[PDB]
Design a protein around this ligand. Structure first.
Ligand SMILES: [Cl-]
Ligand SMILES: [Cl-]
Ligand SMILES: [Cl-]
Ligand SMILES: [K+]
Ligand SMILES: [Mg+2]
Ligand SMILES: [Mg+2]
Ligand SMILES: [Mg+2]
Ligand SMILES: [Mg+2]
Ligand SMILES: [Mg+2]
Ligand SMILES: [Mg+2]
Ligand SMILES: [Mg+2]
Ligand SMILES: [Mg+2]
Ligand SMILES: [Mg+2]
Ligand SMILES: [Mg+2]
Ligand SMILES: [Mg+2]
Ligand SMILES: [Mg+2]
Ligand SMILES: [Mg+2]
Ligand SMILES: [Mg+2]
Ligand SMILES: [Mg+2]
Ligand SMILES: [Mg+2]
Ligand SMILES: [Mg+2]
Ligand SMILES: [Mg+2]
Ligand SMILES: [Mg+2]
Ligand SMILES: [Mg+2]
Ligand SMILES: [Mg+2]
Ligand SMILES: [Mg+2]
Ligand SMILES: [Mg+2]
Ligand SMILES: [Mg+2]
Ligand SMILES: [Mg+2]
Ligand SMILES: [Mg+2]
Ligand SMILES: [Mg+2]
Ligand SMILES: [Mg+2]
Ligand SMILES: [Mg+2]
Ligand SMILES: [Mg+2]
Ligand SMILES: [Mg+2]
Ligand SMILES: [Mg+2]
Ligand SMILES: [Mg+2]
Ligand SMILES: [Mg+2]
Ligand SMILES: [Mg+2]
Ligand SMILES: [Mg+2]
Ligand SMILES: [Mg+2]
Ligand SMILES: [Mg+2]
Ligand SMILES: [Mg+2]
Ligand SMILES: [Mg+2]
Ligand SMILES: [Mg+2]
Ligand SMILES: [Mg+2]
Ligand SMILES: [Mg+2]
Ligand SMILES: [Mg+2]
Ligand SMILES: [Mg+2]
Ligand SMILES: [Mg+2]
Ligand code: NA
Ligand code: NA
Ligand code: NA
Ligand code: NA
Ligand code: NA
Ligand code: NA
Ligand code: NA
Ligand code: NA
Ligand code: NA
Ligand code: NA
Ligand code: NA
Ligand code: NA
Ligand code: NA
Ligand code: NA
Ligand code: NA
Ligand code: NA
Ligand code: NA
Ligand code: NA
Ligand code: NA
Ligand code: NA
Lengths: 73, 237, 56
RNA sequence: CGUGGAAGUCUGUUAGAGUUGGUGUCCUACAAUACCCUCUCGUGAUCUAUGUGUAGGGGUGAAAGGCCCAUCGAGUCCGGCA
RNA sequence: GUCGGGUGAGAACCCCGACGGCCUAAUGGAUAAGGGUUCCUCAGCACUGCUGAUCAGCUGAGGGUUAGCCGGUCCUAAGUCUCACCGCAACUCGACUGAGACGAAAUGGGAAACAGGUUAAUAUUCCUGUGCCAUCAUGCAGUGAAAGUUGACGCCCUGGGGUCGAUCACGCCGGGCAUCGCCCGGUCGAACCGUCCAACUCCGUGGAAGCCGUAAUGGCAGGAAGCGGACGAACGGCGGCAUAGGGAAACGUGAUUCAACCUGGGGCCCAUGAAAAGACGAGCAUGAUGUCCGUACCGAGAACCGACACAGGUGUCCAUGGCGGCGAAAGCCAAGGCCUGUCGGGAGCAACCAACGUUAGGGAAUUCGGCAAGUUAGUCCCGUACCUUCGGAAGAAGGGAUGCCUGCUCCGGAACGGAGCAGGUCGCAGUGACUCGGAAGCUCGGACUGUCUAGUAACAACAUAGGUGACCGCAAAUCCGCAAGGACUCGUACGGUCACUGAAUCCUGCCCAGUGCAGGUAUCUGAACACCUCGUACAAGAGGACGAAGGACCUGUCAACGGCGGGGGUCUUAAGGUAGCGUAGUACCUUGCCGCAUCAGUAGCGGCUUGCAUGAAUGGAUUAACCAGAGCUUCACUGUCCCAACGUUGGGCCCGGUGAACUGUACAUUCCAGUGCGGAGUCUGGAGACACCCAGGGGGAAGCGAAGACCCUAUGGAGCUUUACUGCAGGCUGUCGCUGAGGACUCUCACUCCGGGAGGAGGACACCGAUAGCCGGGCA
RNA sequence: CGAGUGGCUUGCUACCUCGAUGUCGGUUCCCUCCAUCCUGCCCGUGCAGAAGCGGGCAAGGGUGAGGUUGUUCGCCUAUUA
RNA sequence: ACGACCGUAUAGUACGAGAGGAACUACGGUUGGUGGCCACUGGUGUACCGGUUGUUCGAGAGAGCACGUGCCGGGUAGCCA
């Protein structure tokens, strides 16, 4: 997806933009229901197109390693 | 010579001020008489222009509608509680004493009732370690062990928007847009690229600082530049 | 762009105007202050000893 | 294969911005920074009107000691001053 | 511009007609600012007008701007002011906090107006017709009334609805042309009132396990399609308005593409895209009221700013007039405007100059350098190398095609849309004008887009993402203020401050002795107050004891300032140059040596390289892409050159009118020599020399222009620097005051901070006032 | 080793100009000098001839085009009397 | 206002073992310079004639504009090398 950058910026920058945005654009399982219908609405904002559940998550992923730890303890 | 840039800052002119009139809310904890009978419902999740992180709109029982510093995992419909008897779930706020040890926390108060000061940026958290009748030991995101009054309120969970820093800005324009939402002057011209009159490092036939960069703590403003009271520099040893 | 003639073209802004208090065209309509009599800044009339030679 | 239509992306005298070469014309000028051809940018850190803020050892400065009303390695006015 | 004509004492430029032209995002139409009467009329020409003038933005005199519904006014924005409070020696000064007010005329929000007519000059303002809003009063209705909705919103892509315009078809009216039968214009009609409703959302029915749907994404047993229904749009349709208005007349009907306007779907954000007044919610009749300010005109190659009627500068809307074509492009032409980018007349019109066309043969020989010019060019088909970050390189390169006419096919609902086929046929040439890349390679630099010396520098300089180090837990670090106070901060380490380096790739060695910063420190040194001794009936003063920060001393630290040699098979002073790169944009010697290339190459490239004086974030090497960046090579091209010619337009020359400036000790027709303060029209000796005038190119007047910017001198100036001299802020630290009770300790009552409060934390410390020591180019 | 001439280089001096005599190189256009490179006329020769070398008179005319370099200078190439 | 060179005859001769190899003189040409001229060749030639693209005058005919010829082809006189 870093193809929009053409021959600019170098490997690292666009490799990481591709990887990050790739995971960001993946189907995400809604915490409310269970359908793979969560999309990003903005920075740290996630929403299910199915049930409409709007929630906070990571900046580019709905769940972060830190957030997954909270549940435990 | 002339006043250095760091000196122009303090005057608080337009160029150095934050676009406050464009900000949404001052994120402070609600005030409760006692009892804890204060709960509300998350009505919406909004973007906070002052922090590049999400924030939650909550509607409280007693009719109060306010924005709250949102931890990760808070969504519309969720019921949040604030007080001594608040449930121990993510997104709720209660004094450190009522919080079980080993639980990640955010928006920690420095002095009880100040509304929260520590661990508020994207994806960060403080770690409540020790309890007592006198002191609650909390580990801040910087790694420091902070002694706090157990009466200092805090929110359960890590701050939302974690991982924001993982992605590179890539281009000047992206930085530009973010910078416009902060109280900062950008871009940054190196001191060594300036004239002697404008900076302690300015001047010369080529670019280099004319003295060592490590400056004393006692140096006066206009001179305190470079590596401030550095205990050490570099990477080796 | 030349700082002379070509830069004189954008000058269509009204600043100094006839002052209500002194009659001079010195009332700065943007600042609401007369640069001649001090109207808008002070109740007392603007005046300085340097407006004349020292021994006069 | 199609669909989709991203980009400080390309071409472009669209509007608009800029100002490389001609060391052309001018150089008691049309003009105290102009004219012509050529040339750069042209969805963005873009350009622009109006309103508004920052004032002189002070501002403002993607830094050239650049700019702050034809005035800048410290504006202008009057005074100190014969 | 020209020919006629009008007026006038007077006419190239004032007016009429014809003919001929110019302007097409403007040279047209509407306006903002700004100007301020420049607007209209009449009378004028002393002034102004690049000539003239009967004309005028000129001179004189009169006249001219009409609003419930167009603006202002009202709201609030960034922000501003006032008062109060506090500070300050003080204020016309000053930050915060309160309260109040101000702050938008094109271009934020916003109750309500349309059509026609009229003047020399106004016009949604006046007149006629019609409509609409708000407030109040009366009457009827209504008890609802405030929850909610609206005002009210970013960037990118896109569907649907749909008017004007444009175009097509056919009819009617009028005009034009005269081999044809075509060509042009018109064919009208508002606000408003009423009505219709697509999209979105929802309800009932239904019951899909694979169907439904889109330009695309998508949707669904958590109930798809289909069927029925609720809510629901246009500045749009339809009816009224309208035997209103307008037109000489006709006084049309359908269609396509569809600006405006309406309504949806999708995508993006380390960026989140105002607020308030107001409106709605919340009926109808009748009547009354609707004041105040603006309104002319220009809006620019003559009404604005630039001293000017200045080739400069100066915002908005008209972005849908025709052909053309991808096009808001060129070129041509309507509507509309203009002949005022305002001096003319004459000479085949010479020299010379400015723009420019064409030049045989040669083809960069020109030159610092292809500077300048030229070449190429649109579109379709074929085809496309090294290298590469796999994106790109790429329009690489290279090859072919291209018109018209006749009849057709295919895509599509269709276009006056697009793609093709067959046949015929003309020219030197079919992107026929116009529009419209020359190409390829090597090297250097900076990664890229971006920034800059307004007015000689656009670059390799600045910025940048990226890399790195430093400070700080927020009663912080950093910074502003004399203070009261303040920025950062509606912020909190995934933060933000202070610096260095400067995309990616491979990497980033050794040195802590000096300097800087930082930590530690037995001992040494280290001020003042208090304390002890001496001295003094007191005091000055001398000395002692104690000893803070700081220093000595020790340690850490170079992606901190910086360093990485001579000698020999260690020495200075810590180390003694590792990967790499290398005659470098760094190499003196130097045109280094060898090779490539050329007839010949101080250039360029490759290799070698002992490097006068390369080298790792003072970053080293290297690098795809990018570049008005520096150098070099090739093909192509050509008046750059051989070597110049002819032509075109504007000047130049002559004539009418207008009409400056520079410069001037005097004299002055000079030339060759000499002399002279050594660079003479003027002195000396000779030579030459009849006067005046026209044109020329500039040899001399050490020509004109500027009290040399080089250099030195002055007990001149300024900006800048620092381990120059001397001081001044600021930071750190001791001490005294605030300040209290019981070399280590407890407490609470001042004081400080948190808390709405209760109360909590801290606490005689801190803050503040005074003073002492250290640091202190931050500043004088 | 000794004696000179020139005023093209360099150095010296500080006379002239600091109320300014515009720089280097190049170019273009004109005049000149001779210490002559060619051409004419000659002398000598280690002058057979041919081709040279050296010298005398002599300034009429000629002395050109290119590659590197800003270069002057100089190096190099092919032509040339 | 003319400078200079090459070639032929002289001559494969004089000279010389050979190799090699002249001159006087008479001729032809070239180069540089100079002055003039235009029959010839060549350039120009916005005189002129033709072709043709776009647009406008309805078509045709015939014309305007496209920078001072829209472009392309030919080109008289004159001026020129
Ligand atoms: Cl940031
Ligand atoms: Cl108005
Ligand atoms: Cl759609
Ligand atoms: K001088
Ligand atoms: Mg806040
Ligand atoms: Mg800012
Ligand atoms: Mg920088
Ligand atoms: Mg600089
Ligand atoms: Mg300094
Ligand atoms: Mg550097
Ligand atoms: Mg550096
Ligand atoms: Mg200026
Ligand atoms: Mg671009
Ligand atoms: Mg472009
Ligand atoms: Mg502004
Ligand atoms: Mg400088
Ligand atoms: Mg008039
Ligand atoms: Mg008149
Ligand atoms: Mg107001
Ligand atoms: Mg408005
Ligand atoms: Mg009018
Ligand atoms: Mg008007
Ligand atoms: Mg004029
Ligand atoms: Mg030729
Ligand atoms: Mg050459
Ligand atoms: Mg040459
Ligand atoms: Mg060129
Ligand atoms: Mg079909
Ligand atoms: Mg062409
Ligand atoms: Mg080089
Ligand atoms: Mg660059
Ligand atoms: Mg400049
Ligand atoms: Mg540039
Ligand atoms: Mg420039
Ligand atoms: Mg740089
Ligand atoms: Mg950085
Ligand atoms: Mg970073
Ligand atoms: Mg960084
Ligand atoms: Mg080399
Ligand atoms: Mg290093
Ligand atoms: Mg005499
Ligand atoms: Mg002087
Ligand atoms: Mg000097
Ligand atoms: Mg000085
Ligand atoms: Mg407080
Ligand atoms: Mg100083
Ligand atoms: Mg002179
Ligand atoms: Mg002689
Ligand atoms: Mg001679
Ligand atoms: Mg023509
Ligand atoms: Na420096
Ligand atoms: Na695809
Ligand atoms: Na230019
Ligand atoms: Na000053
Ligand atoms: Na004075
Ligand atoms: Na005239
Ligand atoms: Na309607
Ligand atoms: Na068209
Ligand atoms: Na760009
Ligand atoms: Na050291
Ligand atoms: Na050290
Ligand atoms: Na080094
Ligand atoms: Na650029
Ligand atoms: Na020419
Ligand atoms: Na002269
Ligand atoms: Na100075
Ligand atoms: Na002089
Ligand atoms: Na010269
Ligand atoms: Na001679
Ligand atoms: Na040479």
């Amino acid at each position: 997806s870093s193809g929009r950058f053409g021959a600019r910026y170098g490997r690292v920058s666009r490799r990481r933009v591709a990887e990050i945005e790739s995971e960001m654009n993946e189907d995400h399982a809604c915490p409310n229901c269970g359908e793979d219908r969560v999309d990003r609405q903005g920075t740290g904002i996630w929403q299910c197109s199915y049930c409409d559940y709007k929630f906070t998550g990571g900046s580019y992923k709905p769940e972060t390693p830190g957030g997954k730890t909270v549940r435990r303890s | 010579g002339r006043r250095i840039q760091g000196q122009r800052r303090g005057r608080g002119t337009s160029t150095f001020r934050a676009p406050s009139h464009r900000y949404k809310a001052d994120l402070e904890h609600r005030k409760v008489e006692d009892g804890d009978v204060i709960a509300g419902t998350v009505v919406d999740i909004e973007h906070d222009p002052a922090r590049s992180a999400p924030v939650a709109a909550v509607e409280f029982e007693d009719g109060d509608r306010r924005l709250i510093l949102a931890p990760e995992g808070v969504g519309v419909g969720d019921e949040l509680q604030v007080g001594v008897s608040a449930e121990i779930a993510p997104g709720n706020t209660l004094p450190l004493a009522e919080i079980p040890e080993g639980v990640p926390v955010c928006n920690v108060e420095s002095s009880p009732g100040d509304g929260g000061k520590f661990a508020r940026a994207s994806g960060v958290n403080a770690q409540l370690l020790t309890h007592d009748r006198n002191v609650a030991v909390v580990k801040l995101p910087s790694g420091e062990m902070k002694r706090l009054d157990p009466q200092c309120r805090a929110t359960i969970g890590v701050v939302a928007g974690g991982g924001r820093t993982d992605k590179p800005f890539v281009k000047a324009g992206n930085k530009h847009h973010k910078m416009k939402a902060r109280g900062t002057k950008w871009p940054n011209v190196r001191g060594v690229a300036m004239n002697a009159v404008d900076h302690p490092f300015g001047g010369g036939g080529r670019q280099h600082p004319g003295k060592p960069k490590s400056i004393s703590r006692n140096a006066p403003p206009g001179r305190k530049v470079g590596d401030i009271a550095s205990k050490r520099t570099g990477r080796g040893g | 762009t030349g700082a002379g003639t070509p830069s004189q073209g954008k000058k269509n802004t009204t600043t100094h105007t006839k002052c209500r208090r002194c009659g001079e065209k010195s009332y700065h309509t943007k600042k609401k202050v007369c640069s001649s009599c001090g109207f808008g800044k002070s109740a007392k009339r603007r005046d300085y000893e340097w407006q004349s030679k020292a021994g006069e």
